[PDB]
Design a protein around this ligand. Structure first.
Ligand SMILES: [Br-]
Ligand SMILES: [Br-]
Ligand SMILES: [Br-]
Ligand SMILES: [Br-]
Ligand SMILES: [Br-]
Ligand SMILES: [Br-]
Ligand SMILES: [Br-]
Ligand SMILES: [Br-]
Ligand SMILES: [Br-]
Ligand SMILES: [Br-]
Ligand SMILES: [Br-]
Ligand SMILES: [Br-]
Ligand SMILES: [Br-]
Ligand SMILES: [Br-]
Ligand SMILES: [Br-]
Ligand SMILES: [Br-]
Lengths: 114, 112
């Protein structure tokens, strides 16, 4: 549960401060999802992100600026040949741990319209 | 792993900001530990704390102010009959989740 994870993590690392609330930005036309912004990412190390659309792996990218406020915007145009993703498709985004051969990863956002 | 817990929690709750670094405050004489302060506790629920000294459960208490900075000091004198705890003893503190009949708790600090 949220509660168990919270206090197991708290006892282990003591302090953490993050905001991975998924902010989905739309393109032109607005039926395309062009990007995903997290207001306050962890920034201790160089995380990457894998993007998967309807089960299709679009690969891994890391060159997204972290703003002094802690925000980071993952631009799907960098994964999808210069286009965003139709909002009728399922988009999964995974945070990929560095120095791991892209093998350690965790789901961090999912777009699925309803 | 710390990393796995971090990202399982992030996906689930999205946003969190806490600091449970255990700051142990001493009494008079200074060989006594009188309290435990956390710099930024969660305040979404009315948490209480259960304290155990050398395996002896002193039970639960919750009457500890949260300051505007988010800090909270658990005063052991409220559990141990007006005295702190000799630093030669082990102190375990559990955070107890409200509305679970005191059955759901997690280790949150240990002095050994
Ligand atoms: Br939950
Ligand atoms: Br729009
Ligand atoms: Br990369
Ligand atoms: Br392109
Ligand atoms: Br291209
Ligand atoms: Br598409
Ligand atoms: Br996952
Ligand atoms: Br999500
Ligand atoms: Br929080
Ligand atoms: Br403090
Ligand atoms: Br209580
Ligand atoms: Br009292
Ligand atoms: Br008492
Ligand atoms: Br008493
Ligand atoms: Br004692
Ligand atoms: Br501890």
């Amino acid at each position: 549960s949220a509660t168990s994870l919270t206090f197991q993590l708290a006892y282990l690392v003591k302090k953490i401060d993050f905001d991975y609330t998924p902010n989905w930005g739309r393109g032109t036309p607005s039926s395309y999802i062009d990007n995903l912004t997290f207001p306050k990412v962890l920034t201790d190390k160089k995380y990457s992100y894998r993007v998967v659309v309807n089960g299709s792996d679009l690969g891994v990218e890391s060159n997204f600026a972290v703003t002094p406020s802690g925000g980071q915007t993952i631009n799907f145009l960098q994964y999808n040949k210069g286009y965003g993703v139709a909002d009728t498709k399922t988009i999964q985004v995974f945070v990929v741990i560095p120095d791991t051969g892209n093998s350690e990863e965790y789901i961090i956002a999912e777009w699925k319209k309803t």
